[PDB]
Curated annotation (Swiss-Prot):
Residue stretches making up the Macro domain: 4-163
Consequence of changing residue 13 to A: Partial loss of ADP-ribose 1'' phosphate phosphatase activity
Binding site for ADP-D-ribose: 13, 27, 35, 115-117
UniProt-reported outcome of changing residue 117 to A: Partial loss of mono-ADP-ribosylhydrolase activity; complete loss of ADP-ribose 1'' phosphate phosphatase activity
Organism listed in the record: Chikungunya virus (strain S27-African prototype)
Function: Seems to be essential for minus-strand RNAs and subgenomic 26S mRNAs synthesis. Displays mono-ADP-ribosylhydrolase activity. ADP-ribosylation is a post-translational modification that controls various processes of the host cell and the virus probably needs to revert it for optimal viral replication. Binds proteins of G3BP family and sequesters them into the viral RNA replication complexes thereby inhibiting the formation of host stress granules on viral mRNAs.
Entry superkingdom: Viruses
Name by which UniProt lists this protein: Non-structural protein 3
PTM annotation: Phosphorylated by host on serines and threonines.
UniProt remark on domains: In the N-terminus, the macro domain displays a mono-ADP-ribosylhydrolase activity. The central part called, the alphavirus unique domain (AUD) has a zinc-binding function. The C-terminus region, also called hypervariable domain (HVD), is mainly disordered and binds several host proteins. This intrinsically disordered domain contains 2 SH3 domain-binding sites and 2 FGDF motifs necessary and sufficient for the formation of nsP3/G3BP complexes.
Complex and partners: Interacts with mRNA-capping enzyme nsP1. Interacts (via C-terminus) with host G3BP1; this interaction inhibits the formation of host stress granules on viral mRNAs and the nsp3-G3BP1 complexes bind viral RNAs and probably orchestrate the assembly of viral replication complexes. Interacts (via C-terminus) with host G3BP2; this interaction inhibits the formation of host stress granules on viral mRNAs and the nsp3-G3BP2 complexes bind viral RNAs and probably orchestrate the assembly of viral replication complexes. Interacts (via C-terminus) with host NAP1L1.
Included stretch of the parent chain: 1334 to 1493 of 2474
UniProt topology in membrane: Peripheral membrane protein
């Protein structure tokens, strides 16, 4: 575990993380993907061997000895708000179990279902609160990776407001 388990947020490419493992905001088919998706694939392509896993689950594949945790958040384009919310909470619970099983002291994580899978809605608070529900009981240092300065500010404020 980390000596003083913390949350931090960084506004940068998760492919350049400084943590002991990475959560890929995965598709269920283990497909390399397109756009910002390809970043994780480009950095750790070996981790996409047999990475396919259902919505609401997480599957870890090693790239060398570096764990890539494929976490499949729901695509809110396909799910009702209610069922998408359930699967989003479940995907993070499976991430907490994987991070624990791996025995890492740190994990880089994105806000699942807030990008291409957001169904065009702002899910910062929804996704972050499910992340906290799952990871609060883990002792890894959690570093949340985002794209936009405003999201960095809002994630930072939500973290600091509990400390
Ligand atoms: Cl997404």
């Amino acid at each position: 575990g980390a000596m003083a388990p913390s949350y931090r947020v960084k506004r940068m490419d998760i492919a350049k993380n400084d943590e002991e493992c990475v959560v890929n905001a995965a598709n269920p088919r283990g497909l390399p993907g397109d756009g910002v998706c390809k970043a994780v694939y480009k950095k750790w392509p070996e981790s996409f061997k047999n990475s396919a896993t259902p919505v609401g689950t997480a599957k870890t594949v090693m790239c060398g000895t570096y764990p890539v945790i494929h976490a499949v958040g729901p695509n809110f384009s396909n799910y009702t708000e209610s069922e998408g919310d359930r699967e989003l909470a479940a995907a993070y619970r499976e991430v907490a179990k994987e991070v624990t099983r791996l025995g890492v002291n740190s994990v880089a994580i994105p806000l699942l279902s807030t990008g291409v899978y957001s169904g065009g809605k702002d899910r910062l608070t929804q996704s972050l609160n499910h992340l906290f529900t799952a990871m609060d009981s883990t002792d890894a240092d959690v570093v949340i990776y985002c794209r936009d300065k405003e999201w960095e500010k809002k994630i930072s404020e939500a973290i600091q407001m509990r400390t």
